[PDB]
Every structure is written in C-alpha cells, then in structure tokens.
Amino acid sequence: FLPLLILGSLLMTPPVIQAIHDAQR
C-alpha cells in the first residue's frame, strides 16, 4: 500500500499522485 505502493513504484518513478497531493497541501 502507501508504502508498498511507493516501494513497488520505487524504480524509475517518484511517489506521484501522493507526493503532488502532499505537496499540494
């Protein structure tokens, strides 16, 4: 999930969707 999700996509891509969302706040 949150972790596993970002982890899984932790190769050649940042924690998008969430990162931008967090940065949005």
Q: Which of 10, 11, 7, 6 is nearest to 21 (CA)?
A: 6
Give the residue numbers spanning the domain of 16.
Answer: 1-25
CA distance 17 to 25: 13
Q: How many domains does the chain have?
A: 1
List C-alpha distances in Å: 22 to 1, 12, 18: 16, 20, 6
CA distance 15 to 1: 12
Technique used: NMR
Under 8 Å between Cβ of 11 and 5: no
